[PDB]
Amino acid sequence: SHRPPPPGHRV
Amino acid sequence: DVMWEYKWENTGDAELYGPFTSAQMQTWVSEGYFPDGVYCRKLDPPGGQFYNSKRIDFDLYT
């Protein structure tokens, strides 16, 4: 069901 | 299955991601991760007339 954070992002 | 790439920006240098299955893409794209949409495009072939995820219909593939 759940899923990990997608690439790219920005923090 | 059918994977779909995704690019945050619309440049030729921007980050190139989205090598996941349409299923995984639909989740992120539907989950709300992309409130503005991303440069979605089928991995194969590599390099084409990209299209905003908000302009694609994954429902007509899965």
Which CATH number belongs to the domain containing residue B3 in this structure?
3.30.1490.40
Experimental technique: NMR
Which residues constitute the domain of residue B50?
1-62
Pairwise CB contact (< 8 Å): B15 & A3: no
State both tokens at B25: 């893409």
Q: Considering only CB atoms, which chain A residues are within 8 Å of B30?
A: none
Total structural domains in chain B?
Answer: 1
- Nearest-5° Cα angle at B60, B48 to A9: 55
The residues near B18 (Cβ < 8 Å, ≥ 6 apart) are A7, B3, B4, B5, B6, B7, B25, B38, B40, B41, B43
Q: Considering only CB atoms, which chain A residues are within 8 Å of B27?
A: 3
CA atoms within 13 A on the CB side of A6: 26
